[PDB]
């Protein structure tokens, strides 16, 4: 051949079993609102109902784990202190 | 600044440490199997979604067959050793060293021109439509 | 007989637990990947050298290519997930279910007749020399 | 085909990085005597100089780790309590 690849420097991103189809706290989805918001509008009045990403690569609705912080303080699928490293998908 | 965002930077450095450790581990494990001629040289890293934002929309395009096989190998190895590290497929990151051939001069592709040049290798005289 | 001897038996049972846990883990990971998995029901058991003595001299032969590929994939998965160890091949242990074919009756081979019957499948009319 | 294999019940045996070519205590081999025995006969007078296998699937000369039990009590390549699950290769 005329051109051949010798080295590769790909970067691999990983995500845990967040179950994009069932929120691990509310069991609706990784998007499309939550149990306490339901309808899309539901008198939104600004604020937000996006996805929250932790330091453990877990994803839930911001509302779900914001409320869950009052019940416990360690991400339910593990035993790690939950951070708020990202907001939204 | 204080221990507000510097903690995030320390976490990013920890992620860098994790990435290089996983890279050397995957190189050691590649030294073991050696099935196909696609893993000749592999400097592949492992990052977490939270630390590094997604580039645009995670590009998903035709990858070259040898690099494609190499990435498959990497994904499998990771999901087995560090079970839970499902490698997503992206293209807007990384680089590569293309060995061209009067001497043998090695080019460099930043994971963008690899597919186009591989298509040229498969068949020259292409255009935008191809 | 004293708990001094039953301690080894308890360790053997712990090894059995480890083996079945690793088996279900490898099945779960094959559900996501499992490229080389010729044996459909790959019931692989992982044991430790100390608990179970070597049969005679760790045998080797013309293992069937589909079970060869299945065992290779299982060993690669086990050497990744559980790193730091090496997997050996042997034949004087285990069993298998051979699907024969007026109805489809499934036979049974205790990892002894698999190679001979595979050679028969490749080409019949063989003898001791073959 | 006439006969096809559906199920397989292979049993996989595993061993740690015992370094069969270099004893992790004496650095001679996994066989062929040890540092304090050297020559094959060396006034053997019965006794034994075989291989010792632990509960952690580690293998060394019986003499090497028998002497090493006086220096420490946790297998050097790990932090596990060393057993004597087998004797000989
Ligand atoms: Zn939710
Ligand atoms: Zn909501
Ligand atoms: Zn978590
Ligand atoms: Zn020694
Ligand atoms: Zn000795
Ligand atoms: Zn040990």
Curated annotation (Swiss-Prot), chains A, D:
Record-listed E.C. numbers: 2.3.2.27, 2.3.2.32
Amino acids binding Zn(2+) 2: 34, 37, 49, 63
Binding-site residues, Zn(2+) 3: 56, 58, 75, 78
Listed result of changing residue 37 to A: Strong reduction in ligase activity
GO cellular component terms, semicolon-separated: Cul2-RING ubiquitin ligase complex; Cul3-RING ubiquitin ligase complex; Cul4-RING E3 ubiquitin ligase complex; Cul4A-RING E3 ubiquitin ligase complex; Cul4B-RING E3 ubiquitin ligase complex; Cul5-RING ubiquitin ligase complex; Cul7-RING ubiquitin ligase complex; cullin-RING ubiquitin ligase complex
Keyword entries, A-Z: Acetylation, Cytoplasm, DNA damage, DNA repair, Host-virus interaction, Metal-binding, Nucleus, Phosphoprotein, Transferase, Ubl conjugation pathway, Zinc, Zinc-finger
Domain of life, per lineage: Eukaryota
Chain sites annotated for binding Zn(2+) 1: 23, 26, 61, 64
Tissue expression remark: Widely expressed.
Catalysed reaction, written as an equation: S-ubiquitinyl-[E2 ubiquitin-conjugating enzyme]-L-cysteine + [acceptor protein]-L-lysine = [E2 ubiquitin-conjugating enzyme]-L-cysteine + N(6)-ubiquitinyl-[acceptor protein]-L-lysine; S-[NEDD8-protein]-yl-[E2 NEDD8-conjugating enzyme]-L-cysteine + [cullin]-L-lysine = [E2 NEDD8-conjugating enzyme]-L-cysteine + N(6)-[NEDD8-protein]-yl-[cullin]-L-lysine
Coiled coil region boundaries: none
EC primary class: transferase
Subcellular location: Cytoplasm; Nucleus
UniProt keyword Coiled coil, yes or no: no
Metabolic or biological pathway, per its Swiss-Prot or TrEMBL entry: Protein modification; protein ubiquitination; Protein modification; protein neddylation
Listed GO biological process terms: cellular response to amino acid stimulus; cellular response to chemical stress; cellular response to oxidative stress; cellular response to UV; DNA damage response; MAPK cascade; negative regulation of canonical Wnt signaling pathway; negative regulation of insulin receptor signaling pathway
Record flagged with keyword Ion transport: no
Zinc finger (RING-type): 34-79
Leader sequence segment: none
Subunit annotation: Component of multiple Cul1-RING E3 ubiquitin-protein ligase complexes commonly known as SCF (SKP1-CUL1-F-box) complexes, consisting of CUL1, SKP1, RBX1 and a variable F-box domain-containing protein. Part of a SCF(SKP2) complex consisting of CUL1, RBX1, SKP1 and SKP2. Part of a SCF(FBXO3) complex consisting of CUL1, FBXO3, RBX1 and SKP1; this complex interacts with PML via FBXO3. Component of the SCF(Cyclin F) complex consisting of CUL1, RBX1, SKP1 and CCNF. Identified in a SCF E3 ubiquitin ligase complex together with HINT1 and CDC34. (Microbial infection) Interacts with human adenovirus 5 protein E1A; this interaction inhibits RBX1-CUL1-dependent elongation reaction of ubiquitin chains by the SCF(FBW7) complex.
Record comment regarding domains: The RING-type zinc finger domain is essential for ubiquitin ligase activity. It coordinates an additional third zinc ion.
Similarity annotation: Belongs to the RING-box family.
Annotated protein name in UniProt: E3 ubiquitin-protein ligase RBX1
Lineage start: Eukaryota, Metazoa, Chordata, Craniata, Vertebrata
Gene symbol of the encoding locus: RBX1
UniProtKB/Swiss-Prot annotation, chains B, C:
Residues making up the signal peptide according to the UniProt record: none
Free-text description of this protein's post-translational modifications in UniProt: Neddylated. Attachment of NEDD8 is required for the E3 ubiquitin-protein ligase activity of the BCR complex. Deneddylated via its interaction with the COP9 signalosome (CSN) complex.
Membrane-spanning intervals of the chain: none
Source organism superkingdom: Eukaryota
Disorder noted: Pseudohypoaldosteronism 2E: An autosomal dominant disorder characterized by severe hypertension, hyperkalemia, hyperchloremia, hyperchloremic metabolic acidosis, and correction of physiologic abnormalities by thiazide diuretics. Neurodevelopmental disorder with or without autism or seizures: An autosomal dominant disorder manifesting in infancy and characterized by global developmental delay, variably impaired intellectual development, and speech delay. Some patients have seizures, others have autistic features or behavioral abnormalities. Additional variable features include cardiac defects, failure to thrive, or brain imaging anomalies.
Subunit annotation: Forms neddylation-dependent homodimers. Component of multiple BCR (BTB-CUL3-RBX1) E3 ubiquitin-protein ligase complexes formed of CUL3, RBX1 and a variable BTB domain-containing protein acting as both, adapter to cullin and substrate recognition subunit. The BCR complex may be active as a heterodimeric complex, in which NEDD8, covalently attached to one CUL3 molecule, binds to the C-terminus of a second CUL3 molecule. Interacts with RBX1, RNF7, CYCE and TIP120A/CAND1. Part of the BCR(SPOP) containing SPOP, and of BCR containing homodimeric SPOPL or the heterodimer formed by SPOP and SPOPL.
Family: Belongs to the cullin family.
Job of this protein: Core component of multiple cullin-RING-based BCR (BTB-CUL3-RBX1) E3 ubiquitin-protein ligase complexes which mediate the ubiquitination and subsequent proteasomal degradation of target proteins. BCR complexes and ARIH1 collaborate in tandem to mediate ubiquitination of target proteins. As a scaffold protein may contribute to catalysis through positioning of the substrate and the ubiquitin-conjugating enzyme.
Leftover remarks: High-glucose conditions in renal tubular epithelial cells lead to up-regulation of CUL3 expression, significant increase in CUL3-mediated ubiquitination of MRPL12 and dysregulation of mitochondrial biosynthesis.
Name assigned to this protein: Cullin-3
Source organism of this protein record: Homo sapiens
Upper lineage: Eukaryota, Metazoa, Chordata, Craniata, Vertebrata
Section of the entire sequence shown: 462 to 615 of 768
């Amino acid at each position: 051949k005329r051109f051949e690849v010798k080295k590769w420097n790909a970067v691999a991103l990983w995500a845990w079993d967040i179950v994009v189809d069932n929120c691990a706290i509310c069991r609706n989805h990784i998007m499309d609102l939550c149990i306490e918001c339901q309808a899309n509008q539901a008198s939104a009045t600004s604020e937000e109902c996006t996805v929250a990403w932790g330091v453990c690569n877990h994803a839930f609705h911001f509302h779900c784990i914001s409320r869950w912080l009052k019940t416990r303080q360690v991400c339910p699928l593990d035993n790690r202190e939950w951070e708020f490293q990202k907001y939204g998908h | 600044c204080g221990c507000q965002f510097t903690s995030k930077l320390e976490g990013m450095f920890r992620d860098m440490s994790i990435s290089n450790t996983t890279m050397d581990e995957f190189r050691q494990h590649l030294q073991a199997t050696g099935v196909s001629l696609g893993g000749v040289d592999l400097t592949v890293r492992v990052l977490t979604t939270g630390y590094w934002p997604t580039q645009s929309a995670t590009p998903k395009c035709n990858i070259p067959p040898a690099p494609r096989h190499a990435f498959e190998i990497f994904r499998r190895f990771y999901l087995a050793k560090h079970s839970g590290r499902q490698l997503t497929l992206q293209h807007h990151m990384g680089s590569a060293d293309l060995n061209a051939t009067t001497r043998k001069h090695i080019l460099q592709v930043s994971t963008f021109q690899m597919t186009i040049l591989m298509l040229f290798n498969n068949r020259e005289k292409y255009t935008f439509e191809e």
